Amino acid sequence: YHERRGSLCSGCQKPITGRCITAMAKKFHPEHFVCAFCLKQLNKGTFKEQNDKPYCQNCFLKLFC
């Protein structure tokens, strides 16, 4: 069986069995947590956020700078 809950991946509304990203309290499957700009892919390890949405540090560095 998985863990106790699994945390729903914001966007999937389904538990995250395995690694899990935690944004503004919103979770995301480590593969569904993408940049709210290019939507290519994203990781809390080095992402950024603006207007309440994720953005790769390179993106934020491109949008915010």
Q: How many CB atoms lie within 10 A of CB 1?
A: 4
Counting contacts by CB under 5 A, is residue 60 touching Zn ion? no
Q: What angle do CA 29, 58, 54 make, to 5 degrees?
A: 40
For Zn ion, the binding residue among 7, 9, 20, 33 (CB under 5 A) is 9
- Per CB under 5 A, the segment of 18-26, 31-39, 45-53 that binds Zn ion is 31-39
Contact 33/19 with Cβ under 8 angstroms? no
Decide if residue 32 touches Zn ion (CB under 5 A): yes
Least separation in angstroms between CB 3 and Zn ion: 16
